[PDB]
Design an enzyme around this catalytic site. Structure first.
Site, PDB file in Angstrom:
ATOM      1  CB  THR C  30      -0.969   0.066   1.210  1.00 46.34           C
ATOM      2  OG1 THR C  30      -0.242   0.280   2.426  1.00 46.34           O
ATOM      3  CG2 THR C  30      -1.811  -1.207   1.330  1.00 46.34           C
ATOM      4  CB  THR C  31       0.237   4.718  -1.178  1.00 47.81           C
ATOM      5  OG1 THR C  31      -0.263   4.135  -2.391  1.00 47.81           O
ATOM      6  CG2 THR C  31       1.152   5.898  -1.520  1.00 47.81           C
TER       7      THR C  31
END
Ligand SMILES: [Cl-]
Lengths: 241, 240, 243, 111, 231, 250, 235, 195, 244
Positions: C30-31
Site C-alpha cells: 500500500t501507499t
C-alpha cells in the site's frame, strides 16, 4: 557454473564475483578525482541529485573517517556506508591501542586486508566499492591511498575513479609529464581545489555549478568538506582567469 | 559445525544412505555365526587377493569386546574400529557402574543404538558395517548370537551370515541347521561353520578364520592347521 | 544465469537481483508517505479495507521509536515490524550510553547498516520494505526513506508503495510552490490529500487514512497520532480536493 | 558484607480435621523491633482447594508461593485441566525447595 | 518454481512461495469461526476426525484466564505458538501483575512468525490462529496468519470453505456486535456462521467445539454434551 | 548472519585432480615473473614491479617482504593473498617460535609454517586456496643459506635457483645454463638481472625492478650498538640506485 | 539439493510425508480400546526362519499403566520409547502419581518435529500408545512423525492398515469385551499378514487397570488362535 | 584408610593392607580389602580420603582393563605406575584433587622381575624394595632397613612382614584390625588367607 | 543458503563406495612410487621423487621419507602438505604415549591412531579426505619389525613387502616374485631398487631421484638405528647393486 556465484577460482584462475563487484563500482555513474598539493590533499567528486524530493545536503559519497583522514567512495551508498563505519571504528580502535592517530596508508591496508578476506571466504561477498583515502600524514606528508574489491591497494601521486576514469587519469598523467613533479606546486589548498576542478572540467568536457560538485580537503591535523558556497567561491575564481 | 542432513527420506520412503551402507556390507568379506548347544563359533572369510600379508599383525576380523563377548563384522574395516572401540569402552563402563559385565543382548543393543544415531544425526553418514555379536552372559551357559546392521535394527539368530555371497551361505545354513538339535559339541559346530564358508570361499584354509567362544570367558582362535583338518575331513566325506 | 537464486550474489551487471526482487514486494504494498515541514515531519499511510469485518482505527500501521521518531513502511508488514523492533533496541542502547535521545541521522544509519547487513549473506533474505521515518532532534526536523538495499537519503518529501508515482508528483508540486516552507498543520492536510490522490492506484477497495506527526510547536517534538477533530479536518480537506 | 536473608517474623498453624483442614497465620510483618505492617496476609489460596503459607523470610516466602501458584497454572495447561491433588502439590513443592538446596528459601512451608 | 526451495528466497515478482505454501496448509485445515460483541468473544471450531474410530482433533487451546485461540492447519505449530503465548501471558502476570493485552499478544505472534520467514534453515509456521480475549479495553478477536500478518476483527473464519462463514458474518456484522450480556445468543450466531461453511457433514455432538471469554466469564472450552444445547 | 560454509570447497574430481589448487596454479601462471638464485655466500630474490598506473607510487607496493631479519619473501600471483600471508608469516615466526626459543626460526621451519597455512585453505571449510606461489630465501646458523618455493597446495621444495609465474619455463631454462655451485652473491645478482630482463616488456631499471638479498650481516642497519651477539639483518633490499649501478655492468 | 524442513506446494512437509511412506512398508500393528482394557497386537514378520522370533520386540512397556506398539523403521522407536519411559518416571518423581496417557503421548509427539539443519530427519515409525488413567479411562493413541496424535477406539498401522481399518470400522462397538477384542486383533492380523498366523510370527498384549501392561505368552496366544479358528469354522 | 605396606623380594611383591574402616567414632568394618587387581600381574593397594580411594582405584582399574582388551596385551608394572602417577599429577592441580596414596606391586613378565612403586596423592613416584604410606613407614622402614635383603624368598618376605605388623600392633594408637596380605609373582596374584 | 555448493564429501555412492576416498586413491596413483620391504634383520624404505629438476637442492629436501620417532619412519605417497599435517599429529601421539607410559609407542597403536583420524574425515565433518597413503616402517619389543600401510579410507594392513603410489600393480607383482621370508636387509635394499628401476616412468633411475632409508637392529649393542640415506650414499648403493 557455481564458480561464478561464490569467491572460488574459475578454470582460468579468475574470481568472477570480484570482477562483478568492480562493475557495481560504476553503478552510481559518478567520477572522483584526488590530487596532492604541498601542504594538502584535495579530493573532488561529482554530485548528482536527480530527484527534486531529495535533501541535497544528505547526498554525499565523501566521509570524514578521522580528524586527519577523509575517504571518498565510488560505488553504491549502502556498501560505501558499510566501509565508512568500519574505517571509522578501525581508526578509533587504532588510536586507543597504539597511542597515535591512524595513518592514511595503514587504514587503507587494513581495509584492503578486510576486502581480501571477502575474496577468500565464501559466506562473505565483496563490497562493490572503491575506497580512496586521503590525508596529510605527519610522517609521509600528503597521501592518497586507494582500495578496491580485490583487496589490492596502492599509494598515488594523483588518481581518478569512475566510468570516465581513464579520461581523467590521462589528463592528470599529461600534466605531471609536463611539470615533472609528484604534486601540485601550490601553497594554498584553495588553488589546489581550483586545479582539481579545472582538470576535471577539461577531462570530462562538462561545466559545473556549485551543486554539481562535492569537495574534500585534507590539511595538517584536519580533513574537512567544502560547503556549496565554498565551492561557488572556487568556481568564481576559475571562471575569472 | 557441519550440520548437513545426509541421511534423509526419499519419495518412496527409503533412506538411501542407510541402504547404500548395506551395499558396502554386501561388498565386505563374508562372516558367519553359528551357535551350538554349549558354544558359539564365528567364521570369517579372508580374501586371497592380498598375499604377502603379515597375518601376525594384520587386524583380525573377530574382535574381543570383553573377555566373554566377541564381535565380527562385514563391511568397511575403518568404520568397524569405531564401533569396536565404543563397545569396549561401554563394556568397562558397565562393569564399573553395575559391578557386572554386559549381557550379549545389552552390548548388541548399545552398538545397534550407535549405528542408529548415525542415521539421524546431522553431518554424519551411517556406518557401512553389519556386526555379528556373540558370547555368553555372566554366570550363564546359554549361547548368544546377535546381528546388527547400519539402520540400527538388531535381532537374535540361531545361525546367521553377513557380507558378500551371504545369500548362498544363508541358503546352506537354512537347510543344514536344525533348531530342535543344534551342533551338540564344539567339533560339530565348527564343522558346520567351515562347511558353510566352503560354499563361498573357493580356496583351502588360509581364507577361513574360525573363533570358538565357550561359557565363562573361554575364547580361543583356531590356527591354520586346525582349520585345515576340518577342510580335509569335509571334502573327503564329500567325495562319495 | 542463476544469479538471482541466491542473496548477496553479484550478477555480471554488478546487481544483487534478490534485493531488486524485494523491491517488487515493496511496490506491491500500500501507499505510504512522509512530508517534512517547518519544525517537524508528517507521516501518512493508506490502509486497504479488505472487508467490513476490519475494526476501524485498530490495525495501526505507523510505529513510534523512542518518543520522538515515527516510522511508516510499505511492503511486507512483518519485515517492517522486525526493523522497527531493531530500531527500538538501537535507540535504547544509544540513550543508555549517551543520555541524549538518538539523533535522526544517527538512527537512520542504525537501520541502514542493519538492512545492508541482510544483503551480505545468502543465509538471510533482504527486507521486503521501504521505510519512511523521521522526527525532531537537536538539529531540527529530518525525514528519511530507507530501501531494501540499505540505501537511504534525507528527503523533503518521500513516498513508496503502489501509489508512489502519483504521490511523488504531488510532493514535487509542494516543494516548488512552498520554498519558504510548509507548516505542520498544513502538512497534515496535504498528507491526507496525497494519500487520497494516490488511492487511484488501489481504487478497487476503499481505504482508511492514518496520519501521525512530530512537530516542535504542535507536539513538543514528540511523535503523536493525528486523532479526532484534526484527523477529520484533514479527511474533509482531502475529500474536497478530489471532488 | 551483604546478607541476602532477613527475618520477617510471624507464625503459622495447620490443623487437619476429618473432612476439613485449616491453615492459620498471624498478619503481623516485622523487621528487628519495627512493625512493617499490622495486616500483611501470609496464608494464600493457591487454587485447586489448596492453601499455602511460607513463613520466615517474607521475600523467599512470596517467591515460593508465587512459583507454586504458577506451577498449578502450568499443571492445568500440561495435563488437560486436571486437579492437582494435595499429595502431588506437596511433591511439587519439595522439588521447588530442593532446587535451591545451595541457596535456600529461608522459610518453613505448610500447605 | 525455482524460488520455492526455501523461505529465504524472493521470487521475481516479490513473493515468498514457502510462506504461500504454509498459507495453503491452513486452507486444507478444518473450518473455525471467530466473532465478538462488546461484552463477549466466541470461538466456534469444526473439529476433524481421521475416521469413525478416531477422535476429533482438538481445535481450541486456552492461553490464560482471559485469552485463548482456535487453530487451523498444522496442530503441532499451533501447540508451539500457543505455548509461546501462554509464556508471554504468564510473564506479564508474574513480572507486571498485569493481564496481557490481546493487541500486544498479536504483535508478539507476528514477530515470532516473521523470524521464521527471513532466516535460512527454518520454515514458516503451517497454521492460522484465531485469538479471542477480554482485556482492559473490552472484547477482542484477532486473525493470525503465518506470514506474520495479524489483524483485529469483529468476526472472521479460517480453514476449508471459510468464505461461506466469512460472508455471513459480513452481512450479520450489525446484529451480532450488539449481542451484549447474552453469551448463548452470541454462540448461536457463531454456530449459524460456521454452518455456512459445511457441505455434506453437519454439526454433531463430538464434532462441534465452542469457546467463550467475556466480562465476567473466564476463557472456557465447551465440548461433548456441553454443546448439544447449540446443535 | 552465519558462516554456513563448514564444508570443503576444494574436493577431488573423478580424475584425482584437486580443481581449486590447479586453478590457483593457473592464477600464479598469469602473475608477473619472480625468481630466486642461491649463491655460496648469499641468496637473491627478484621480480618486476608491474605498475598498475604511472600515477601510482610503486615504491609503496612492496612485492619483496622481510619476514625475519634473516628471511625474505617474493611472490607471483595474487598480491592481496601474498600480503595477508606475509602478515601471518611474520606473526607465526614470533608466536610459534621466537616467544618459545628466544631466537628467529630457521628458513625451512618458517617455510613449513607458511606451507601449513596454505594447506589449510586447501582443506578447511568455506575457503578457496591462496592464489600465490612464494619464493622464500633465508639464512640460519645451522642450515646456512637456502631458497624455498611454496605452492597453493602447501607443497614446498628447496631450490638452487628457480622462477615462477609468467615466463618461468623460459627463465628456468636460462638459470639451468648459468647456475653453478661456485657462484658468489654478485654473480647471482648479475644472473638474476639477466634472467629477469627476458620476461620484462617495457622499462628495465631500478624503479621498475624490485630486488633483495640474503647476504652478510649488516650491523649498520641494526639501529643500536652494545650487543655483540646481535650482528644485524642478513636480509637487505637493494636500492633503486644500487640496481642501476649493476645494470651498467650488464 | 533442498531443505529438510521444506514445505511442498500443497502445504505439507516433504520429509514428514516421505516418512509416512516408510511406515506403510512396516509390519502391521493393531490396537483396540474397550471398557475392559486396550489390546495391542503386532505382526512380527521374521525375515528368515533362523531368526529367533521371540527377540522381535515390537510391543514395549512404557510404564505399568502404558504400553506401546510400533510399525515402520523400528530402530527409530528406541529413543522415542526411552523418552516416554523417562517422561513417565520423571512425572511420577515430580508429582507422586501416574502420568496421563494423553500427556505421555503429547511428550513423545513433541520430539517428532525437532528436525532440521536437533536430529537430521523425522522418525520413520508410527506408534500405537495404549494405556489407562483415572481421568479418561482406557485410551489408545496413534502417534505419527508429523507431531500429530489422534485418539482412536481402534486403529491399524503398517502395510495392511487401510484394509485392516475398514475391517475395524465394521467390527468395533462400544460394548466389546477384552476376550472379543483379543480375537478381533488376531482375526484382522491373520487377514492382512502374508505368512500364516501363529504364536511365533504374531504377538498380543493388553493393558488393564488391575494387572497393568502385559505382553502375552506364546502359549496364551496359541490358545486364543485355536479359539479363533474354531469360532470362524462355527459359521 | 590407615596402613598399606609393600615389600619386593627375589621373585615376588607382597602387599599388606589394613582391614579396618573407621568413620569417626565407630569401626564400621573389619574385613575391608584396600586393593584392586589392575591386570593379571599388577596389584594396586590404596589409602587416603573416604570415597576418593575406591573411586580412583576403580577408575584406574577400568582404564588398564580397557588397554588390555584393546591391545590384547598386559602393560608392564612400570607403564601402569607411570599412567597412575600422571593421573595423580593431573589431579593435584584440579578443582578437587584425589586424596589417594597408592602402592603398585607388579611382576614384569618380560624382565622376570618383581617391582614395587610407591606413589602419593601429589604424583610423587618412586621405585622401592619396600614401601609404606602414612604413619606406617615411621615404624616399618627402620625394621626393613635392618632385616631386608634383595634375595629373600616369599616365605622370608612374609616373616619380615609379620614383624612389621607386630610392631605396628604394638606401637600405633589405632586398631587397624590386622591386614590382608597378597602376593604378586610370575603365576599372578593370590591372597594369603591366614595371617 | 550454503547447501547449494556442498560437494558432500562423506557420502556413499549407489554401489557402496566413498566417492572422495576413491578419487583420493586415484590422486595417490599418480604420486611417485614408494616401496617398503621387511627383512628378518631390518626394514627398507625406498621411494621415488616426482620433481626431477637439476636445480632442486636434494640434500636438504624431504618429500617422501619422514621420521615419526627414533623407532618408526614413514614413506609418503600423495599430497606432501597433507602428509605433514598427519605426520606432526603422529609425532605428538608418540610423545603423548611416551609421557604417559614411559615406554616407546608400539608401532600398531600409532598406525591405528593415524588411520582413525583419516577415517573420521570420511564419516563426518564435510571436509575432503587426506590425499595420502603412508608406508609405516617400525620396530617395537612386542612384534619386532613391522610394515604397515594406511590410505585415505582409514583402513590399514600389515605387510612383508608393499608398494604405494604409481604402478603398484606392476611393483607388487615384482616384489611377490622375488621376495622370500628368510631374506636380509642387504638383499631387500637390492630388491627395492630393482623394483623401482623397472616400474619407474623415467628413462633411468638415478641418485637425485631417490629417497632411501633403513631401520636396522644392527646398531651398537642391540639397539635400533634409523638411517635416512644422504644423496651420496644413495649414489653408492646404486653402483653397489649395479643399476648405474
Ligand atoms: Cl589486517
Amino acid at each position: 557454473g557455481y564458480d561464478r556465484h561464490i569467491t572460488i577460482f574459475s578454470p582460468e584462475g579468475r574470481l568472477y564475483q570480484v570482477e562483478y563487484a568492480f562493475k557495481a563500482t560504476n553503478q552510481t555513474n559518478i567520477n572522483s578525482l584526488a590530487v596532492r598539493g604541498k601542504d594538502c590533499t584535495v579530493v573532488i567528486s561529482q554530485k548528482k541529485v536527480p530527484d527534486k524530493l531529495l535533501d541535497p545536503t544528505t547526498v554525499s559519497y565523501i566521509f570524514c573517517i578521522s580528524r586527519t583522514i577523509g575517504m571518498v567512495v565510488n560505488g553504491p551508498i549502502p556498501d560505501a556506508r558499510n566501509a565508512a563505519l568500519r574505517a571509522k571504528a578501525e581508526a578509533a580502535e587504532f588510536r586507543y591501542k597504539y597511542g597515535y592517530d591512524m595513518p592514511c596508508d595503514v587504514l587503507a591496508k587494513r581495509m584492503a586486508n578486510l576486502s581480501q578476506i571477502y575474496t577468500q571466504r565464501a559466506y562473505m561477498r565483496p563490497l562493490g566499492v572503491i575506497l580512496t583515502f586521503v590525508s596529510v600524514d605527519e610522517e609521509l606528508g600528503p597521501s592518497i591511498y586507494k582500495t578496491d574489491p580485490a583487496g589490492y591497494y596502492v599509494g598515488y601521486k594523483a588518481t581518478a575513479t569512475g566510468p570516465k576514469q581513464q579520461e581523467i587519469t590521462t589528463n592528470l598523467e599529461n600534466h605531471f609529464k609536463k611539470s615533472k613533479i609528484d604534486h601540485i606546486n601550490e601553497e594554498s589548498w584553495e588553488k589546489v581545489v581550483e586545479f582539481a576542478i579545472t582538470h576535471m572540467i577539461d577531462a570530462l568536457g562538462t561545466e559545473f555549478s556549485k551543486n554539481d560538485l562535492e569537495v574534500g580537503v585534507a590539511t595538517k591535523d584536519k580533513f574537512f568538506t567544502l560547503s556549496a558556497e565554498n565551492i561557488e567561491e572556487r568556481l568564481v575564481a576559475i571562471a575569472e582567469q | 559445525g557441519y550440520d548437513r542432513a545426509l541421511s534423509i527420506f526419499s519419495p518412496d520412503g527409503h533412506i538411501f544412505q542407510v541402504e547404500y551402507a548395506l551395499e558396502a556390507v554386501k561388498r565386505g568379506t563374508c562372516a558367519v555365526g553359528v551357535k551350538g548347544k554349549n558354544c558359539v563359533v564365528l567364521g570369517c572369510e579372508r580374501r586371497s587377493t592380498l598375499k604377502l600379508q603379515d597375518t601376525r599383525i594384520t587386524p583380525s576380523k573377530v574382535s574381543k569386546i570383553d573377555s566373554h563377548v566377541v564381535l565380527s563384522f562385514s563391511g568397511l574395516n575403518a568404520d568397524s574400529r569405531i564401533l569396536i572401540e565404543k563397545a569396549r569402552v561401554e563394556a568397562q563402563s558397565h562393569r564399573l557402574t553395575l559391578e557386572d559385565p554386559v549381557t550379549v543382548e545389552y552390548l548388541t543393543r548399545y552398538v545397534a543404538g550407535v549405528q542408529q544415531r548415525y542415521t539421524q544425526s546431522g553431518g554424519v553418514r551411517p556406518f557401512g558395517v553389519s556386526t555379528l555379536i556373540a558370547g555368553f552372559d555372566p554366570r550363564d551357559d546359554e549361547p548368544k548370537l546377535y546381528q546388527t546392521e547400519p539402520s540400527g535394527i538388531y535381532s537374535s539368530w540361531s545361525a546367521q551370515t553377513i557380507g558378500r555371497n551371504s545369500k548362498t551361505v544363508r541358503e546352506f545354513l537354512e537347510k543344514n541347521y536344525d533348531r530342535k538339535e543344534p551342533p551338540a559339541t564344539v567339533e560339530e559346530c565348527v564343522k558346520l561353520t567351515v562347511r558353510s564358508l566352503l560354499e563361498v570361499v573357493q580356496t583351502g584354509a588360509k581364507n577361513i578364520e574360525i573363533t570358538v567362544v565357550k561359557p565363562d570367558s573361554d575364547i580361543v582362535a583356531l590356527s591354520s592347521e586346525e582349520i585345515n583338518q576340518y577342510v580335509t575331513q569335509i571334502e573327503q566325506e564329500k567325495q562319495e | 544465469t542463476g544469479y538471482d537464486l541466491s542473496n548477496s550474489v553479484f550478477s555480471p551487471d554488478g546487481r544483487n537481483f534478490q534485493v531488486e526482487y524485494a523491491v517488487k514486494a515493496v511496490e506491491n504494498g500500500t501507499t505510504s508517505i512522509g512530508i517534512k515541514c517547518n519544525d517537524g515531519v508528517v507521516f501518512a499511510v493508506e490502509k486497504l479495507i479488505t472487508s467490513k469485518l476490519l475494526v476501524p482505527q485498530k490495525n495501526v500501521k505507523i510505529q513510534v521509536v523512542d518518543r520522538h521518531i515515527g516510522c511508516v513502511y510499505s511492503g511486507l508488514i512483518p519485515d517492517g515490524r522486525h526493523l522497527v523492533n531493531r530500531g527500538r533496541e538501537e535507540a535504547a542502547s544509544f540513550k543508555k550510553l549517551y543520555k541524549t535521545p538518538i539523533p535522526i541521522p544517527a538512527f537512520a544509519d542504525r537501520l541502514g547498516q542493519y538492512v545492508q547487513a541482510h544483503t551480505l549473506y545468502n543465509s538471510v533474505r533482504p527486507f521486503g520494505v521501504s521505510t519512511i521515518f523521521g522526527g525532531v532532534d537537536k538539529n531540527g526536523a529530518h525525514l528519511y526513506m530507507l530501501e531494501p538495499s540499505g540505501s537511504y537519503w534525507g528527503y523533503k518529501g518521500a513516498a513508496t508503495g503502489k501509489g508512489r508515482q502519483s504521490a511523488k508528483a504531488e510532493l514535487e508540486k509542494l516543494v516548488d510552490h512552498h520554498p519558504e516552507g510548509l507548516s505542520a498543520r498544513e502538512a497534515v492536510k496535504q498528507a491526507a490529500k496525497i494519500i487520497y490522490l494516490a488511492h487511484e492506484d488501489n481504487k478497487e477497495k476503499d481505504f482508511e487514512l492514518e496520519i501521525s506527526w512530530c512537530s516542535l510547536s504542535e507536539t513538543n517534538g514528540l511523535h503523536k497520532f493525528v486523532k479526532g477533530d484534526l484527523l477529520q479536518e484533514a479527511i474533509d480537506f482531502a475529500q474536497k480536493e478530489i471532488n | 558484607q551483604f546478607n541476602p536473608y532477613g527475618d520477617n517474623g510471624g507464625t503459622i498453624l495447620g490443623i487437619a480435621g476429618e473432612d476439613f483442614a485449616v491453615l492459620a497465620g498471624d498478619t503481623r510483618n516485622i523487621t528487628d523491633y519495627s512493625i512493617n505492617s499490622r495486616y500483611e496476609p501470609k496464608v494464600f489460596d493457591c487454587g485447586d482447594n489448596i492453601v499455602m503459607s511460607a513463613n520466615g523470610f517474607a521475600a523467599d516466602g512470596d517467591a515460593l508461593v508465587k512459583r507454586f501458584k504458577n506451577s498449578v497454572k502450568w499443571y492445568h495447561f500440561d495435563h488437560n485441566d486436571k486437579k492437582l491433588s494435595i499429595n502431588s502439590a506437596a511433591r511439587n513443592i519439595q522439588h521447588l525447595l530442593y532446587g535451591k538446596r545451595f541457596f535456600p528459601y529461608y522459610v518453613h512451608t505448610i500447605i | 518454481n525455482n524460488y520455492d526451495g526455501d523461505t529465504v528466497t524472493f521470487s521475481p515478482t516479490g513473493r515468498l512461495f514457502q510462506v504461500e505454501y504454509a498459507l495453503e496448509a491452513i486452507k486444507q485445515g478444518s473450518v473455525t469461526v471467530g466473532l465478538r460483541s462488546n461484552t463477549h468473544a466466541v470461538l466456534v471450531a469444526l473439529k476433524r476426525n481421521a475416521d469413525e474410530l478416531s477422535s476429533y482433533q482438538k481445535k481450541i487451546i486456552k492461553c490464560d484466564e482471559h485469552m485463548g485461540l482456535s487453530l487451523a492447519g498444522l496442530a503441532p505449530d499451533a501447540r508451539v505458538l500457543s505455548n509461546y503465548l501462554r509464556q508471554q501471558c504468564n510473564y506479564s502476570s508474574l513480572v507486571f501483575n498485569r493481564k496481557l493485552a490481546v493487541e500486544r499478544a498479536g504483535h508478539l505472534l507476528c514477530d515470532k512468525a516473521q523470524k521464521n520467514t527471513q532466516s535460512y534453515g527454518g520454515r514458516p509456521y503451517g497454521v492460522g490462529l484465531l485469538i479471542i480475549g477480554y482485556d482492559k479495553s473490552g472484547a477482542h478477536l484477532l486473525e493470525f496468519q503465518p506470514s506474520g500478518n495479524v489483524t483485529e476483527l469483529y468476526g472472521t473464519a479460517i480453514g476449508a470453505r471459510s468464505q461461506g462463514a466469512k460472508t455471513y458474518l459480513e452481512r450479520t456484522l450489525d446484529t451480532f456486535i450488539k449481542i451484549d450480556g447474552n453469551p448463548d445468543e452470541l454462540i448461536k450466531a457463531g454456530v449459524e456462521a460456521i454452518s455456512q461453511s459445511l457441505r455434506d457433514e453437519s454439526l454433531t455432538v463430538d464434532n462441534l467445539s465452542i469457546a467463550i471469554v467475556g466480562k465476567d466469564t473466564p476463557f472456557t472450552i465447551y465440548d461433548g454434551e456441553a454443546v448439544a444445547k447449540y446443535i | 548472519m552465519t558462516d554456513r560454509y563448514s564444508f570443503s570447497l576444494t574436493t577431488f574430481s573423478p580424475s584425482g585432480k584437486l580443481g581449486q589448487i590447479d586453478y590457483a596454479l593457473t592464477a600464479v601462471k598469469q602473475g608477473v615473473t619472480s625468481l630466486g638464485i642461491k649463491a655460496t655466500n648469499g641468496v637473491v630474490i627478484a621480480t618486476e614491479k608491474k605498475s598498475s598506473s604511472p600515477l601510482a607510487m610503486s615504491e609503496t607496493l612492496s612485492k619483496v617482504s622481510l619476514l625475519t631479519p634473516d628471511i625474505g619473501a617474493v611472490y607471483s600471483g595474487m598480491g592481496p593473498d601474498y600480503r595477508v600471508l606475509v602478515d601471518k608469516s611474520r606473526k607465526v615466526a614470533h608466536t610459534s617460535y621466537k616467544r618459545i626459543y628466544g631466537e628467529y626460526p630457521p628458513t625451512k621451519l618458517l617455510v613449513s609454517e607458511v606451507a601449513k597455512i596454505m594447506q589449510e585453505a586447501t582443506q578447511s571449510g568455506g575457503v578457496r586456496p591462496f592464489g600465490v606461489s612464494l619464493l622464500i630465501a633465508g639464512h640460519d646458523e645451522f642450515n646456512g643459506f637456502s631458497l624455498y618455493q611454496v605452492d597453493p597446495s602447501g607443497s614446498y621444495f628447496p631450490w638452487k635457483a628457480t622462477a615462477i609465474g609468467k615466463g618461468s619455463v623460459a627463465a628456468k631454462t636460462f638459470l639451468e645454463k648459468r647456475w653453478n655451485d661456485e657462484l658468489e652473491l654478485e654473480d647471482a645478482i648479475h644472473i638474476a638481472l639477466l634472467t629477469l630482463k627476458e620476461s620484462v616488456e617495457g622499462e628495465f631499471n631500478g624503479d621498475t625492478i624490485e630486488l633483495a638479498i640474503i647476504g652478510d650481516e649488516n650491523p649498520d642497519l641494526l639501529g643500536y650498538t652494545g650487543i655483540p651477539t646481535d650482528k644485524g639483518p642478513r636480509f637487505r633490499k637493494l636500492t633503486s640506485q644500487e640496481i642501476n649501478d649493476r645494470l651498467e655492468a650488464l | 539439493d533442498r531443505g529438510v524442513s521444506t514445505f511442498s506446494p500443497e502445504g505439507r512437509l516433504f520429509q514428514v510425508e516421505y516418512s509416512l511412506e516408510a511406515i506403510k512398508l512396516g509390519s502391521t500393528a493393531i490396537g483396540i480400546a474397550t471398557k475392559e482394557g486396550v489390546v495391542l497386537g503386532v505382526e512380527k514378520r521374521a525375515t528368515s526362519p533362523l531368526l529367533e522370533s521371540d527377540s522381535i520386540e515390537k510391543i514395549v512397556e512404557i510404564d505399568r499403566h502404558i504400553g506401546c506398539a510400533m510399525s515402520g523403521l523400528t530402530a527409530d522407536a528406541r529413543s522415542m520409547i526411552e523418552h516416554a519411559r523417562t517422561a513417565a518416571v520423571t512425572h511420577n518423581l515430580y508429582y507422586d502419581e501416574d502420568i496421563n496417557v494423553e500427556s505421555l503421548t503429547q511428550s513423545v509427539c513433541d520430539l517428532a518435529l525437532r528436525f532440521g539443519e536437533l536430529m537430521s530427519r523425522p522418525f520413520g515409525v508410527a506408534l500405537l500408545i495404549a494405556g489407562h488413567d483415572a481421568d479418561d479411562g482406557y485410551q489408545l493413541f496413534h502417534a505419527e512423525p508429523s507431531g500429530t496424535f489422534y485418539r482412536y477406539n481402534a486403529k491399524a498401522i503398517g502395510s495392511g492398515s487401510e484394509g485392516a481399518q475398514a475391517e475395524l470400522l465394521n467390527e468395533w462397538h462400544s460394548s466389546l469385551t477384552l476376550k472379543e477384542a483379543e480375537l478381533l486383533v488376531l482375526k484382522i492380523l491373520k487377514q492382512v499378514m502374508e505368512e500364516k498366523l501363529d504364536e511365533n510370527n504374531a504377538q498380543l498384549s493388553c493393558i488393564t487397570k488391575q494387572d497393568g501392561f502385559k505382553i502375552y505368552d506364546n502359549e496364551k496366544t496359541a490358545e486364543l488362535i485355536k479359539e479363533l479358528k474354531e469360532k470362524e469354522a462355527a459359521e | 584408610m590407615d596402613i598399606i605396606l609393600g615389600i619386593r623380594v627375589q621373585d615376588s611383591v607382597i602387599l599388606a593392607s589394613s582391614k579396618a574402616v573407621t568413620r569417626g567414632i565407630s569401626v564400621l568394618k573389619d574385613s575391608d580389602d584396600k586393593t584392586r587387581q589392575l591386570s593379571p600381574h599388577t596389584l594396586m593397594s590404596f589409602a587416603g580420603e573416604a570415597g576418593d580411594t575406591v573411586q580412583f582405584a576403580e577408575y584406574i582399574q577400568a582404564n588398564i582393563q580397557l588397554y588390555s582388551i584393546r591391545e590384547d596385551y598386559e602393560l608392564s608394572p612400570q607403564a601402569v605406575s607411570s599412567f597412575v602417577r600422571q593421573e595423580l599429577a593431573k589431579s593435584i592441580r584440579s578443582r578437587r584433587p584425589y586424596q589417594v596414596n597408592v602402592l603398585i606391586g607388579g611382576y614384569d613378565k618380560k624382565k622376570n622381575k618383581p617391582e614395587l612403586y610407591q606413589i602419593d596423592y601429589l604424583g610423587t613416584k618412586v621405585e622401592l624394595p619396600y614401601g609404606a604410606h602414612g604413619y606406617s613407614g615411621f615404624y616399618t622402614f627402620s625394621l626393613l632397613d635392618h632385616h631386608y635383603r634383595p634375595d629373600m624368598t616369599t616365605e622370608e618376605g612374609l616373616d619380615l612382614l609379620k614383624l612389621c605388623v607386630q610392631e605396628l600392633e604394638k606401637r600405633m594408637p589405632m586398631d587397624f584390625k590386622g591386614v590382608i596380605v597378597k602376593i604378586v609373582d610370575k603365576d599372578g596374584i593370590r591372597q594369603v588367607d591366614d595371617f | 543458503g550454503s547447501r547449494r555448493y556442498d560437494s558432500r564429501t562423506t557420502i556413499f555412492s549407489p554401489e557402496g563406495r566413498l566417492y572422495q576416498v576413491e578419487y583420493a586413491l586415484e590422486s595417490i596413483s599418480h604420486a611417485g612410487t614408494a616401496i617398503g620391504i621387511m627383512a628378518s634383520d631390518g626394514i627398507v624404505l625406498a621411494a621415488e621423487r616426482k620433481v626431477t629438476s637439476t636445480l632442486l637442492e636434494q640434500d636438504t629436501s624431504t618429500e617422501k621419507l619422514y621420521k615419526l620417532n627414533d623407532k618408526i619412519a614413514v614413506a609418503v605417497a600423495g599430497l606432501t602438505a597433507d602428509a605433514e599435517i598427519l605426520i606432526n599429529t603422529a609425532r605428538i601421539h608418540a610423545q603423548n604415549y611416551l609421557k604417559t607410559y614411559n615406554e616407546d609407542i608400539p608401532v600398531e597403536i600409532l598406525v591405528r591412531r593415524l588411520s582413525d583420524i583419516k577415517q573420521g574425515y570420511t564419516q563426518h565433518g564435510g571436509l575432503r579426505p587426506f590425499g595420502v597413503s603412508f608406508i609405516y616402517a617400525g620396530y617395537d619389543d612386542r612384534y619386532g619389525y613391522q610394515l604397515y600401510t594406511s590410505n585415505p579410507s582409514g583402513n590399514y594392513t600389515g605387510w612383508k613387502a608393499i608398494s604405494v603410489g604409481a604402478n603398484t600393480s606392476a611393483a607388487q607383482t615384482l616384489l611377490q616374485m622375488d621376495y622370500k621370508d628368510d631374506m636380509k636387509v642387504d638383499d631387500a635394499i637390492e630388491l627395492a631398487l630393482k623394483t623401482l628401476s623397472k616400474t619407474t616412468d623415467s628413462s633411468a633411475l638415478t641418485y637425485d631421484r631417490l629417497e632411501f632409508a633403513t631401520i636396522r637392529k644392527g646398531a651398537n649393542d642391540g639397539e635400533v638405528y634409523q638411517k635416512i640415506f644422504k644423496p651420496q650414499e644413495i649414489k653408492d648403493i646404486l653402483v653397489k647393486t649395479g643399476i648405474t
